[PDB]
Amino acid sequence: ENLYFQGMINILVASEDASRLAHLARLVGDAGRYRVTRTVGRAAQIVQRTDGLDAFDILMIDGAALDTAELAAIEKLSRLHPGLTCLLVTTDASSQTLLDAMRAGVRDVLRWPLEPRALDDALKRAAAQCAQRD
Amino acid sequence: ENLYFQGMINILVASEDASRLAHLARLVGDAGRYRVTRTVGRAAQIVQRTDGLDAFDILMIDGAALDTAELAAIEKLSRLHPGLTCLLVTTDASSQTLLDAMRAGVRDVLRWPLEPRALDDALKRAAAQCAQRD
Ligand SMILES: [Cl-]
Numbered sequence: 159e160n161l162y163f164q165g166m167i168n169i170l171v172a173s174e175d176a177s178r179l180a181h182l183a184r185l186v187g188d189a190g191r192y193r194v195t196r197t198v199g200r201a202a203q204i205v206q207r208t209d210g211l212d213a214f215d216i217l218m219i220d221g222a223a224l225d226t227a228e229l230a231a232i233e234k235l236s237r238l239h240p241g242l243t244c245l246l247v248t249t250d251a252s253s254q255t256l257l258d259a260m261r262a263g264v265r266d267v268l269r270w271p272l273e274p275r276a277l278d279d280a281l282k283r284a285a286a287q288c289a290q291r292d
Numbered sequence: 293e294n295l296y297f298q299g300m301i302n303i304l305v306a307s308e309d310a311s312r313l314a315h316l317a318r319l320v321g322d323a324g325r326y327r328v329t330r331t332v333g334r335a336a337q338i339v340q341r342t343d344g345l346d347a348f349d350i351l352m353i354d355g356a357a358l359d360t361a362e363l364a365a366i367e368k369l370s371r372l373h374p375g376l377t378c379l380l381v382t383t384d385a386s387s388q389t390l391l392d393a394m395r396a397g398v399r400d401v402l403r404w405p406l407e408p409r410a411l412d413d414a415l416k417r418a419a420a421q422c423a424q425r426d
């Protein structure tokens with residue numbers, strides 16, 4: 159019941175798997191007019207592109223193999239990019255991973271297989287968290 | 293192994309119970325030189341003080357009775373105050389409450405009874421998320 163100008167929202171979709179990446183990006187593209195960018199990189203490689211990251215409002219990470227090194231990288235990532243909202247897509251809603259995500263700066267956790275209604279709700283919440291980028 | 297100037301950090305501690313409030317504030321005061329402010333108000337009353345809230349870096353909420361109205365209030369609170377880090381202190385680490393907190397903008401969930409090491413870790417993480425206040 160709260161609309162945001164979707165075309166104004168830059169989403170970075172990150173996954174190691176070509177098929178999952180294409181599917182995640184296709185699902186975001188179906189949810190609204192959000193400007194979607196794809197990457198095959200891991201959170202530890204993404205952090206190294208400080209200027210490039212500044213252009214995004216949302217970072218949707220596929221959490222296939224959550225390691226302590228990647229949680230630390232996501233922590234470094236949300237720390238240096240407070241304007242960036244990190245969403246984690248996983249196949250595990252166990253308390254430990256949910257709490258580890260939160261402590262790494264994640265704002266939402268989405269269940270895989272991803273659901274249109276769930277995604278649209280997630281994106282509506284993340285649109286509300288968007289700040290002006292210069 | 294990453295230090296922040298604790299005296300520079302303004303913490304608002306919120307609880308309905310006089311005894312819990314005093315105990316939470318005493319525990320924060322023992323964790324470091326953080327400037328601590330106490331309130332008996334609920335998240336729905338706190339949101340109404342926009343200018344006052346701007347002065348805080350951290351909001352530690354006692355989550356004794358988490359209602360949908362208060363999660364919405366915390367959502368409104370983190371939405372209008374992106375510089376404010378909300379920590380929730382509860383006696384329930386169930387996935388549903390953990391995920392509901394995250395979707396309401398909470399950055400960390402602490403277990404009651406509160407533990408010094410846990411708190412010091414939580415506060416160190418929240419210090420890293422502090423942004424310049426004007
Ligand atoms: Cl790429």
Ligand SMILES: [Cl-]
Binds near residue numbers: 206207208209210
């Ligand atoms: Cl760069």
Ligand SMILES: [Cl-]
Binds near residue numbers: 330331332333
């Ligand atoms: Cl008071």
Ligand SMILES: [Cl-]
Binds near residue numbers: 340
């Ligand atoms: Cl005010």
